[PDB]
Amino acid sequence: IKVRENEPFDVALRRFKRSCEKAGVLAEVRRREFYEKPTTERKRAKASAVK
Amino acid sequence: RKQVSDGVAHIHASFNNTIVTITDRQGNALGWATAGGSGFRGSRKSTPFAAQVAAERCADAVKEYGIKNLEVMVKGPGPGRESTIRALNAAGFRITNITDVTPIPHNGCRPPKKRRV
Amino acid sequence: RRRVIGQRKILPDPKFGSELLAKFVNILMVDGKKSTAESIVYSALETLAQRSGKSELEAFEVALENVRPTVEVKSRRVGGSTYQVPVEVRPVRRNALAMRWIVEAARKRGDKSMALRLANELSDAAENKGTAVKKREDVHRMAEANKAFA
RNA sequence: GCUUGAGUCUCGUAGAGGGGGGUAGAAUUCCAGGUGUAGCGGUGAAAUGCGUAGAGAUCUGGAGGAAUACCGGUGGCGAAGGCGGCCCCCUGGACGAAGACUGACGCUCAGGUGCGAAAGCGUGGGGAGCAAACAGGAUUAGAUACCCUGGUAGUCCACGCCGUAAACGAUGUCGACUUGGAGGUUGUGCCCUUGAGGCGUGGCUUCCGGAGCUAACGCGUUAAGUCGACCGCCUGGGGAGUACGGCCGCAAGGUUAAAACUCAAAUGAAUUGACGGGGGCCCGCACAAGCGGUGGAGCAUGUGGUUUAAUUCGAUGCAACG
């Protein structure tokens, strides 16, 4: 993101910054979009959370 | 003839390749290098080691200008995305700014199906 | 397998004493003949000893500890590579690879007696030439030129 | 006649309700210009393709079309189909809250009318991306495919038309009732509201489960429970959702819908095993890691084939073949 280091180091980490982008946002868009498919799989995680 | 101490270090972290290009501050190209000059093919194009190979070639072709500040423009997935950052720094540049210009789908184009296997 | 492998005791050279020199007998064992082996060892040692400085243990030892690899390549689909990935080996297996290659190299000579063959080959190990060395220069060539994780 | 059914009115509630009209930014693309240079692109590898005629990348400017990252969720709304930026205008539905009127005005429905995703068809616009088709390249033995590079129609819009979809909660619609748990959402009354909150009472909505039902799986107060009202349909599979005709359609076909013949099942759910180039896990010289062979050569030895009057007979994937 446009978050940046405040003093010049390689200690400061930029895979922090892959927090808001590439987070369901990229690395799965390169496939054609069908309305059924992302709607269905969500219902798997709420048996998970209660159980 | 350009010399301004600062310039964007653009990096195109291609998921299939890695290009590294150092542009002026005003977006006027100065140097570039890639996996294909490094002497790689395949998905070997896209590794940390290989990214070093290009990041550093590119350094011999832009250092004589006198640039030594970075404005990192990480763009796309593609491993070896921070080898390059680190490489530059570790070779007479300094970090200043980590910026994002990265294409983000709003689905203003239609993505292909690609390989369905 | 359950647990991990044990170690197995091997006796060093009696006349000068170097485990590593005795692991060179092991490498030169064919027919099982350790007897007829203990000849060739000293036979190559002297050649070395005259022509070269250092110790007589470091006519072999050192000279070899620079034409031994530090990477071996196998492969597996773990890391997401279909390719031959470098592997920094334990220092003992470093030896084993080179020792082996050097011995193949003196049955590719017809330079009379596995003494005189293997002898002059090891003298050129410090001189860094001979097709024994060049195997390293093919492994490490692949690995670093076509790095695909590690 | 009566009001509690139903319905209207009133006052609000929230929402991707609809339709038309405006509009934004990102992104992709192209065009223009600059910079910069020998590759780019792709893949499992590659090649076609695209590069010195200066691409890719990078910046700057312009143009356009389509879609709206996040939001965003069994979240919400709609009768269903279905509906995503944002605004305006016109407008629909639901709900809740008080009361108030009307006075069974209702439910459902063969026929009929209306709504109907996508593709498609006509006419005119428009054309970014993707992509039937189509053309190379690749894979394979073949490959009119998966795979890669492109790319036309189309997708988009206006208007009309066709009316189909495992049109799916595979559950007709409406009403009436019957244990409960936990969650979502959305109103409202009340509580030192002395808590970010506590108790009620509704609307819509999911997951789970008792009884019960069912062949089981499960369904389970939004039923497949327990009832009713009316309608729709089914009546072995294959033949065949086809033919023939009628009807509708511009057409494609849709709509209605058989019979002969033919088979003894077809079918559902669940069990066990088996298998899976399924998944998870775990082993064995199974592999890796090594070291030595065989197959090359000759001979021994067995077999097959063939010949011979007989080449005695048996053994045949490992698990027959010194």
UniProtKB/Swiss-Prot annotation, chain A:
Keywords: Ribonucleoprotein, Ribosomal protein, RNA-binding, rRNA-binding
Keyword RNA-binding in record: yes
GO molecular function ontology, one term from the record: structural constituent of ribosome
Compositionally biased residues, Basic residues: 43-51
GO BP annotations listed: cytoplasmic translation; ribosomal small subunit assembly
Gene Ontology CC entries for this record: cytoplasm; cytosol; cytosolic small ribosomal subunit
Keyword rRNA-binding attributed: yes
Subunit structure: Part of the 30S ribosomal subunit. In stalled ribosomes contacts ribosome rescue factor SmrB.
Role: Probbly involved in recognition of ribosome rescue factor SmrB in stalled/collided disomes; fusion of protein fragments to its N-terminus decreases ribosome rescue in the presence of SmrB.
Family membership: Belongs to the bacterial ribosomal protein bS21 family.
Name recorded for this polypeptide: Small ribosomal subunit protein bS21
Classification lineage: Bacteria, Pseudomonadati, Pseudomonadota, Gammaproteobacteria, Enterobacterales
Gene that this polypeptide is encoded by: rpsU
From Swiss-Prot, chain B:
Cited Pfam families: Ribosomal_S11
Domain of life: Bacteria
UniProt subunit comment: Part of the 30S ribosomal subunit. Interacts with proteins uS7 and bS18. Cross-links to IF-3. In stalled ribosomes contacts ribosome rescue factor SmrB.
GO cellular component: cytoplasm; cytosol; cytosolic small ribosomal subunit
Molecular function GO terms recorded: small ribosomal subunit rRNA binding; structural constituent of ribosome
Function: Located on the platform of the 30S subunit, it bridges several disparate RNA helices of the 16S rRNA. Forms part of the Shine-Dalgarno cleft in the 70S ribosome.
Keywords, alphabetical: Methylation, Ribonucleoprotein, Ribosomal protein, RNA-binding, rRNA-binding
InterPro entries: Ribosomal_uS11, Ribosomal_uS11_bac-type, Ribosomal_uS11_CS, Ribosomal_uS11_sf
Note: Has been predicted to contact the N-terminal domain of IF-3 based on footprint studies; exactly how IF-3 interacts with the 30S subunit is controversial.
UniProt record similarity statement: Belongs to the universal ribosomal protein uS11 family.
Native species: Escherichia coli (strain K12)
Record protein name field: Small ribosomal subunit protein uS11
GO BP, sorted A to Z: cytoplasmic translation; translation
From Swiss-Prot, chain C:
This protein's record includes keyword RNA-binding: yes
Keyword check for Ribonucleoprotein: yes
Keywords, comma-separated and alphabetical: Ribonucleoprotein, Ribosomal protein, RNA-binding, rRNA-binding, tRNA-binding
Cellular compartments per GO CC: cytoplasm; cytosol; cytosolic small ribosomal subunit; membrane; ribosome
Entry GO MF terms: mRNA binding; rRNA binding; structural constituent of ribosome; tRNA binding
Protein family (similarity comment): Belongs to the universal ribosomal protein uS7 family.
Misc. comment: The strain K12 sequence is shown.
Assembly and oligomerization: Part of the 30S ribosomal subunit. Contacts proteins S9 and S11. Cross-links to IF3 and the P and E site tRNAs.
Function: One of the primary rRNA binding proteins, it binds directly to 16S rRNA where it nucleates assembly of the head domain of the 30S subunit. Is located at the subunit interface close to the decoding center, where it has been shown to contact mRNA. Has been shown to contact tRNA in both the P and E sites; it probably blocks exit of the E site tRNA.
Protein name in UniProt: Small ribosomal subunit protein uS7
Natural source organism: Escherichia coli (strain K12)
Region of the whole protein represented: 3 to 152 of 179
